Structures are given as structure tokens and as C-alpha cells.
């Protein structure tokens, strides 16, 4: 789930 | 030091514009493709919103992921219900300020039944005259309302977070009515609304799974929505999801 994982780590 | 509700108020994402071009005419395929493309962007917003919820980041990162995938539709239908309630007292679906479906516009054969389903959510907001703060607390509770049967990896943090927002829902009730000793009826009515969201959303989830899988309808989904749905499809079909209900039905 590449995109969901990205959004949860971002920032 | 200001209140958790005031924080909830601040971190609420602004309504997105769809950019739907009404100069080309309405079709079932076009409308649904547009709604999904919008929903993808709304879910992105929702991830950023959840990350700002005090407590949420204490959860294990698989749990954060799971809750978001399990509840995204009810999150989105609830906000849709709210926007439609404020915009037109539930007479219209306000997907976006440039994408408003009125009675006349829902008359498309394949759209009609899904609109009736979304319309009942907002009619609950009308029937109960939900206040903004009540809506905000309920919405976080929705994020925390659907779980795997095998449970979560940080179950105890999860239980503590649920308690926090249940109390917070209590404070919303107080701000609205004052210190009435019938605030207990209201709490009751509001948890019953939350419970009824599983049923109301189930119909929307069926449409969504159906249109995602039966691609002969040509309905487009953005990558954000595709990732979640294709991940959730086999779980819901394997009957492996547990809805949390406040009252045994
Ligand atoms: C009936 C279902 C339920 C619909 C969703 C209901 C909630 C919602 C509210 C919005 O403000 C924007 C998009 C969404 C998130 C949505 F409207 C679209 O995604 C299209 C959707 C999945 C649906 O219409 C389809 O399956 C069409 O393919």
C-alpha cells in the first residue's frame, strides 16, 4: 500500500 | 491552553472544489468518475486530518493504516451528509460547491438509488439538528468504528483514544444544550446515529465495490481510492471486519 504508507510518514 | 474541540475545529479540512465542467452534459459514467476523482482528493485530506488527531499517532502504524482503510467511506459520507445539511437542509447533495446534485439531477437511472442512500445520512443530521462540534466528535468516532476481528496491534492505546473522544462528544453535547439533565437522551441519540452509519454506509460500499470490480461500466478510480478498495475488498468479502456498535441491536 505504497501511497497510504507514504502519506502516513510524510512531513 | 485551548480545548481539544477547538483543535478539532482548526484541523477540519476546507471543502474541496471538484472543477466539474457542466458545459459537457451529465452521464452516469461521467458523474461517478468525477465523484471518485474528488473522493481520492478528499481521502488524501483525511489522512492529513487523522495525523493531527491527538492520540492517533500513538497507534501502531499498521493500525493507523487499517482504521483509515476500514472507515474511509463512512468518513466521507458523514461529511457529505454534513455539507448537504448546511448547504440545503438535506434537499440536495453538496459534493462540492461546484458539484451540487438536486432532485432533478439525481433522476439519472443509475445514480438515483445511490443518491437516495447518501440523502438519508443528511436527513439524520436534519432530524437531530446536529451541531458542528457534535459532528466533529462523531466523525473521529467513525474513524475508530470499524476494526479487524483479530483486533489491533495496539489495542490499549486504541481503547484509550475511543474513551477520549467519547468524553469529548459529551462536551459537545453540553456546549449545545447547556447543563440539561436530559443530556443523557442526546448522548443516546448520537451513539445510535453512529451505530446506524454501518448500515447506511454498507449500501454505498456495495455500489463502490461493484463499480470498481465490474469495469464494464467504465467507472474510473484514482490510485488513492484503488489502493484502499482493492485492499479492502477481500477483507469485507471474507466477512473479516468487525463494526463496533454502542447498542446491541
Ligand atoms: C455510491 C458510491 C459512494 C460514493 C462516495 C460517497 C462519499 C463521497 C463523498 C464525496 O464528497 C466525494 C466522493 C465520495 C467518496 C463518493 F461520492 C465517490 O467516491 C463515489 C462513490 C464511491 C459511489 O458513488 C460509487 O461507487 C460511484 O462509482
Amino acid at each position: 500500500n505504497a501511497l497510504l504508507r507514504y502519506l502516513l510518514d510524510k512531513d | 491552553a485551548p480545548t481539544l474541540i477547538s483543535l478539532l475545529e482548526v484541523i477540519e479540512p476546507e471543502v474541496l472544489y471538484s472543477g466539474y465542467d457542466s458545459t459537457l452534459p451529465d452521464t452516469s459514467t461521467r458523474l461517478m468518475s468525477t465523484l471518485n476523482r474528488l473522493g481520492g482528493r478528499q481521502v488524501v485530506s483525511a489522512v492529513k486530518w487523522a495525523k493531527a488527531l491527538p492520540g492517533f499517532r500513538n497507534l501502531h502504524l499498521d493500525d493507523q493504516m487499517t482504521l483509515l482503510q476500514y472507515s474511509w467511506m463512512s468518513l466521507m459520507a458523514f461529511s457529505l451528509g454534513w455539507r448537504s445539511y448546511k448547504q440545503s437542509n438535506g434537499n440536495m447533495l453538496c459534493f462540492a460547491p461546484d458539484l451540487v446534485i438536486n432532485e432533478e439531477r439525481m433522476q439519472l437511472p443509475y445514480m438515483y438509488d445511490q443518491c437516495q442512500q447518501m440523502l438519508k445520512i443528511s436527513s439524520e443530521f436534519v432530524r437531530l439538528q446536529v451541531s458542528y462540534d457534535e459532528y466533529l466528535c462523531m466523525k473521529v468516532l467513525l474513524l475508530l468504528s470499524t476494526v479487524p476481528k483479530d483486533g489491533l496491534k495496539s489495542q490499549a492505546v486504541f481503547d484509550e483514544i475511543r474513551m477520549t473522544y467519547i468524553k469529548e462528544l459529551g462536551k459537545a453535547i453540553v456546549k449545545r444544550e447547556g447543563n440539561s439533565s436530559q443530556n443523557w437522551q442526546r448522548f443516546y441519540q448520537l451513539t445510535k446515529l453512529l451505530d446506524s452509519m454501518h448500515e447506511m454506509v454498507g449500501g454505498l460500499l456495495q455500489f463502490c465495490f461493484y463499480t470498481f470490480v465490474n469495469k464494464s461500466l467504465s467507472v474510473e478510480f484514482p490510485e488513492m481510492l484503488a489502493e484502499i478498495i482493492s485492499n479492502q475488498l477481500p477483507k469485507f468479502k471474507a466477512g473479516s471486519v468487525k463494526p463496533l456498535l454502542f447498542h446491541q441491536k
Side-chain angles (χ1 to χ4, degrees), chain B residues 93-107:
Chain B
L93 293 170
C94 181
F95 289 95
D98 61 356
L99 191 59
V100 176
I101 315 316
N102 59 19
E103 218 198 302
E104 226 170 323
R105 233 182 144 189
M106 297 164 209
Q107 300 313 300

Side-chain angles (χ1 to χ4, degrees), chain B residues 73-111:
Chain B
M73 182 72 78
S74 68
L75 255 22
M76 241 81 284
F78 211 59
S79 303
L80 176 56
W82 174 262
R83 290 195 306 279
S84 303
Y85 162 48
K86 299 317 278 164
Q87 176 266 325
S88 71
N89 207 41
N91 299 293
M92 311 189 201
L93 293 170
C94 181
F95 289 95
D98 61 356
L99 191 59
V100 176
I101 315 316
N102 59 19
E103 218 198 302
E104 226 170 323
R105 233 182 144 189
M106 297 164 209
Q107 300 313 300
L108 271 16
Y110 193 70
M111 298 304 303

Side-chain angles (χ1 to χ4, degrees), chain B residues 31-40 42-43 72-73 76-80 83 94-96 110-111 114-115 117-118 203-209 211-212 219-221 225 229:
Chain B
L31 226 14
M32 297 189 274
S33 292
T34 295
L35 298 172
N36 288 321
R37 180 181 183 174
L38 174 60
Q42 290 174 359
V43 170
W72 79 271
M73 182 72 78
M76 241 81 284
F78 211 59
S79 303
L80 176 56
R83 290 195 306 279
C94 181
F95 289 95
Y110 193 70
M111 298 304 303
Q114 45 195 289
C115 295
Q117 282 175 48
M118 297 169 227
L204 305 175
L205 243 8
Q206 201 207 36
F207 277 119
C208 177
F209 292 153
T211 64
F212 180 76
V219 166
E220 301 186 10
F221 281 87
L225 256 38
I229 305 167

Side-chain angles (χ1 to χ4, degrees), chain B residues 59-217:
Chain B
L59 291 169
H60 188 28
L61 214 119
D62 286 28
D63 284 341
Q64 310 197 5
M65 192 157 62
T66 290
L67 297 179
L68 253 359
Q69 327 196 121
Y70 278 50
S71 69
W72 79 271
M73 182 72 78
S74 68
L75 255 22
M76 241 81 284
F78 211 59
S79 303
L80 176 56
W82 174 262
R83 290 195 306 279
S84 303
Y85 162 48
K86 299 317 278 164
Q87 176 266 325
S88 71
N89 207 41
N91 299 293
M92 311 189 201
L93 293 170
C94 181
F95 289 95
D98 61 356
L99 191 59
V100 176
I101 315 316
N102 59 19
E103 218 198 302
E104 226 170 323
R105 233 182 144 189
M106 297 164 209
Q107 300 313 300
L108 271 16
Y110 193 70
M111 298 304 303
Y112 179 81
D113 215 278
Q114 45 195 289
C115 295
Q116 297 310 300
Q117 282 175 48
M118 297 169 227
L119 221 37
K120 63 195 173 197
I121 292 160
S122 59
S123 84
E124 284 296 86
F125 285 104
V126 173
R127 184 180 62 85
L128 289 165
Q129 303 291 292
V130 173
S131 77
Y132 191 49
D133 292 323
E134 285 176 322
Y135 156 72
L136 299 175
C137 298
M138 284 176 75
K139 189 153 63 60
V140 357
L141 263 359
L142 286 179
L143 171 63
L144 306 164
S145 293
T146 314
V147 301
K149 283 182 180 170
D150 304 327
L152 264 1
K153 288 187 191 180
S154 47
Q155 191 62 47
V157 184
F158 177 79
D159 299 333
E160 276 310 300
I161 172 137
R162 283 189 57 79
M163 289 201 232
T164 301
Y165 294 93
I166 290 158
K167 284 195 276 185
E168 219 42 51
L169 184 65
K171 307 190 195 170
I173 294 163
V174 165
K175 294 184 56 173
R176 184 199 184 242
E177 260 163 42
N179 308 325
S180 175
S181 82
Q182 308 327 293
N183 283 345
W184 77 276
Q185 315 211 241
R186 185 74 178 166
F187 182 84
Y188 178 82
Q189 285 180 313
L190 265 25
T191 49
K192 199 96 190 156
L193 173 59
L194 289 161
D195 284 6
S196 77
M197 281 292 291
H198 294 300
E199 194 264 9
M200 298 197 287
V201 168
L204 305 175
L205 243 8
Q206 201 207 36
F207 277 119
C208 177
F209 292 153
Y210 179 90
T211 64
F212 180 76
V213 147
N214 188 245
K215 50 211 93 214
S216 81
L217 270 80

